[PDB]
Design a protein around this ligand. Structure first.
Ligand SMILES: Nc1ncnc2c1ncn2[C@@H]1O[C@H](CSSCc2ccccc2)[C@@H](O)[C@H]1O
Ligand SMILES: Nc1ncnc2c1ncn2[C@@H]1O[C@H](CSSCc2ccccc2)[C@@H](O)[C@H]1O
Lengths: 273, 274
């Protein structure tokens, strides 16, 4: 199993990537995992640089579309961001036995994004557990964009005593404020010019919050209401760990909305008072 | 600093973090870490787990002692006597600082056999095994075949989650009459202790009847059990060695469970069919 440094090395077999990761961590190099699903956009690249600026770092980026909850291009971007290792497993190699032992998330997984799709987080956490066992990284990187996934991953790491640091990375935005997503490729300049409502409603809510939680929401609800063809799935104010109603201190505002069949998510830091 | 470690003696910690800092560090120096999960109240059975762990070139042995909700110096003195250098004895609160939250969900095998009476028992069992694995990160981890279904599910945990550890299954330690040692044996009256032999007697009969095939081995075992008073059989089942469907020839496993008074006893044995 061969690792050519300063270059992009691509492994498919769990065993190879594991052996190398292990070899490397002996050499005093610190392994950083960036789990992806392919289709890398400027927003994944934030995740890569964050990892990259860790002194000693060897970066592993995994590209795996999990069938339960652009290979070349992604690789080019990677060779170009200076990434040394890409882990691209097959489905057979990740599920030789199908769904057998799986992770069951806590009750947070049935809410929000888990409300319509109630096994999605089980799917997600199960693969993240396998990735972190395969690669045993020092730190593992996730975008704040999918903030509920982030919190759930931290519970995973805590509840199972996993020896890995979870770094959440702040969302990356187009110049008008729209959260970068693959999904924004879909969207007529109709829908896509309306798409800016999500972040505008969030940033307004965040400013209005001096007047309280209640003003912050009305603000945001007012902004979406004034947007052509944005159908809200949810708009929700939570504590940073995604419990209740942030007392009145500080927390998170979350939004999910359809434009056509294209579902968008976004969230922001909020302080009340 | 790494916490305080004194070679050749019993070092105790109950801080998950302390035993993880120490485990890591010994490893970096060329000791191979062995873990023995126990629930306290040790006896020979546990002790042969401990000896198999010791007999690895360069081993440091780690015995955890913790009692598993969703499934004393007596004990440590046994460990000292056995030359074990690390005991791990965390509190319920240290293992579960946020309550039951994220847990392991087993394959369908967790529903069968022992998971008939206790449909959520193994979820509890695997969730804490995972945890200990992650805290201690041993090279090898040790279980008795006594609890064979347990041991097959731990193997499935290890394969499905891509865990770094070799699972070693340790041959059942028996009384002189062949009764599998278990803390529960202290409870059987003399009549029961006596009828209690029937379990192993049927399994070994089965194992030798087996050169005539599967139905022979099962009928042999059933006869031995029918010749016992006060032994209510929960199941008697033969399976392949990973616990799938009754095999047609070659390796396999025979499991039994039975109530004597209020005591529930278990036992299983390897089978070669024909
Ligand atoms: N605009 C954006 N800004 C920041 N991060 C972004 C982003 N868009 C996407 N991401 C970040 O991309 C990451 C990877 S894709 S889903 C994570 C995963 C991968 C494999 C198995 C299970 C779970 C996410 O952590 C997301 O938050
Ligand atoms: N007579 C006997 N012979 C051999 N092993 C025996 C035994 N009696 C018990 N054992 C073996 O003694 C070990 C200790 S019992 S606790 C198992 C556990 C610990 C922590 C979390 C989940 C589950 C077991 O591996 C059992 O099979």
């Amino acid at each position: 199993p061969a690792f050519h440094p300063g270059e992009l090395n691509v492994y498919s077999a769990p065993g190879d990537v594991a052996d190398v990761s292990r070899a490397l961590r002996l050499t005093g190099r610190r392994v950083m995992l960036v789990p992806t699903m392919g289709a890398l956009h400027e927003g994944h690249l934030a995740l890569v640089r964050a990892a990259k600026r860790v002194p000693g770092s060897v970066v592993v980026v995994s590209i795996f579309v999990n069938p339960m909850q652009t290979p070349d291009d992604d690789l080019a971007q990677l060779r170009a961001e200076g990434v040394e290792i890409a882990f691209t497993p097959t489905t057979a190699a990740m599920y030789p036995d199908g769904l057998r032992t799986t992770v069951q998330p806590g009750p947070l997984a049935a809410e929000l994004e888990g409300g319509p799709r109630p096994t999605h987080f089980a799917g997600v956490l199960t693969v993240v557990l396998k990735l972190l066992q395969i690669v045993r990284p020092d730190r593992v990187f996730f975008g704040e964009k999918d903030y509920q996934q982030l919190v759930l991953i931290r519970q995973l790491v805590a509840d199972f005593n996993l020896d890995v640091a979870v770094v959440g990375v702040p969302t990356v935005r187009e110049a008008d404020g729209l959260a970068m997503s693959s999904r924004n490729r879909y969207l007529d300049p109709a829908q896509r010019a309306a798409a800016v409502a999500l972040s505008a409603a969030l940033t307004a809510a965040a400013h209005a919050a001096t007047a309280g939680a209640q003003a912050a929401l009305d603000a945001a609800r007012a902004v979406l209401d004034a947007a052509p063809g944005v159908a809200v799935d949810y708009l929700e104010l939570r504590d940073i760990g995604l419990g209740p109603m942030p007392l009145n201190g500080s927390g998170r505002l979350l939004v999910a909305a359809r434009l056509g069949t294209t579902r968008l998510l976004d969230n922001i830091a909020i302080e009340i008072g």
